[PDB]
């Protein structure tokens, strides 16, 4: 089409342990069109220091991006990725599940 909804995976770079510095990733892929907004959340608040990869695309032309930030996981803190795109009637929030 020109419009396909993003696949979203939210994961740490390394297996998470409390008190040990790591990287929180949100990988968004398979989307068109390219305009997309991705935020990483800590206990519901947008994290400020977030970097992303350079826009690229797959064989079928659909786009992918990695958004990432350094973090130190704790027992209580909850993390998530919030994505908005033209295919979504509201932002989609995908929680970080440390087993995935």
């Amino acid at each position: 089409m020109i419009q396909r909804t993003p696949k979203i995976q939210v994961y740490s770079r390394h297996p998470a342990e409390n008190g040990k510095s790591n990287f929180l990733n949100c990988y968004v892929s398979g989307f068109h069109p390219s305009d997309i907004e991705v935020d990483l959340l800590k206990n519901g608040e947008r994290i400020e220091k977030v970097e992303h990869s350079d826009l690229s695309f797959s064989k079928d032309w659909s786009f992918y991006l990695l958004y990432y930030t350094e973090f130190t996981p704790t027992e209580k803190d909850e993390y998530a990725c919030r994505v908005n795109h033209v295919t979504l009637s509201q932002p989609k929030i995908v929680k970080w599940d440390r087993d995935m």
């Binding site: 020109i2 990287f23 069109p33 826009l55």
Partner: protein, 275 residues
């Protein structure tokens, strides 16, 4: 390793209210990004993204910057030409995407080359496998094909794909050999998570691998099973390596009949994991 590729990916996105399109270019050797250009960035230069490309001297960087800006201007022109051919308004944003490159085999000789172009995420025009003619998706692309046939555009591009492209790929593979020609076998393990009191998910993990190509397969009694399985897209770790998992739902107590096989270039023999 030996089959290897060099590929470039380019995206331009028009900005109809004011100014020029956003242009992003990225270059890869296999699954390693080595250069980038972003029209929004301050440098206005082709920038290194791997240590082994930083070897290259000023003449290299000047030349790649000049060429990548030329790519950007062709994309700009094309966005205008295509808006006209499809009789579209000035209101909407549109996209062009281009990918080209070359593959060499284990002997490091040319294996194949390619150049594909899309408008708004749909095929527009692509070089055929023989590198001699073009595949046009629609009648606007057909007009382009006749223009490019007359101007012998394929012949020029073919020269690059069989010449410079494979020559510089070999150069980069040599210069970056310590990483580019190193395979990083997946670190594998299985996890087990109850879904209820009588069924559980087995998840077969492959971590920290390079290159990105991998196959994870679940078996029950040694035969492939795809029902009640889930395989995620291979994803970047962020450190240059890749991750993937595959899961299967099984009756609790029956885990031992299931096996996960992992195939990767870095493994002499596929791995077999069993709970």
């Amino acid at each position: 390793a030996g089959s290897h590729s060099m590929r470039y990916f380019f995206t331009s996105v028009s900005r109809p209210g004011r100014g020029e399109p956003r242009f992003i270019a990225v270059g890869y050797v296999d699954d390693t990004q080595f250069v980038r250009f972003d029209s929004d960035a301050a440098s206005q230069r082709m920038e290194p993204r791997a240590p082994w490309i930083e070897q290259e001297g000023p003449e290299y960087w000047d030349g790649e910057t000049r060429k990548v800006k030329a790519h950007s201007q062709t994309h700009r022109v094309d966005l205008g030409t295509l808006r006209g051919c499809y009789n579209q308004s000035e209101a909407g944003s549109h996209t062009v995407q281009r990918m080209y490159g070359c593959d060499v085999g284990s002997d490091w000789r040319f294996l194949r080359g390619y150049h594909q172009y899309a408008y708004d995420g749909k095929d527009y025009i692509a070089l055929k496998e023989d590198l001699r003619s073009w595949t046009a998706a629609d009648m606007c692309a057909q007009t382009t094909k006749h223009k490019w046939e007359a101007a012998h555009v394929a012949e020029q591009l073919r020269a690059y794909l069989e010449g410079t492209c494979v020559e510089w790929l070999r150069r980069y593979l040599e210069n970056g050999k310590e990483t580019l020609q190193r395979t990083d076998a997946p670190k594998t393990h299985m996890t087990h998570h109850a879904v209820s009191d009588h069924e559980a998910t087995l998840r077969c993990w492959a971590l920290s691998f390079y290159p990105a190509e991998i196959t994870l397969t679940w078996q029950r009694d040694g035969e492939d099973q795809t029902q009640d399985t889930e395989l995620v897209e291979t994803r970047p770790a962020g450190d240059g390596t890749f991750q993937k998992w595959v899961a299967v739902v099984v009756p609790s107590g029956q885990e031992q009949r299931y096996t996960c096989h992992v195939q990767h270039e870095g493994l002499p023999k596929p791995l077999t994991l069993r709970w």
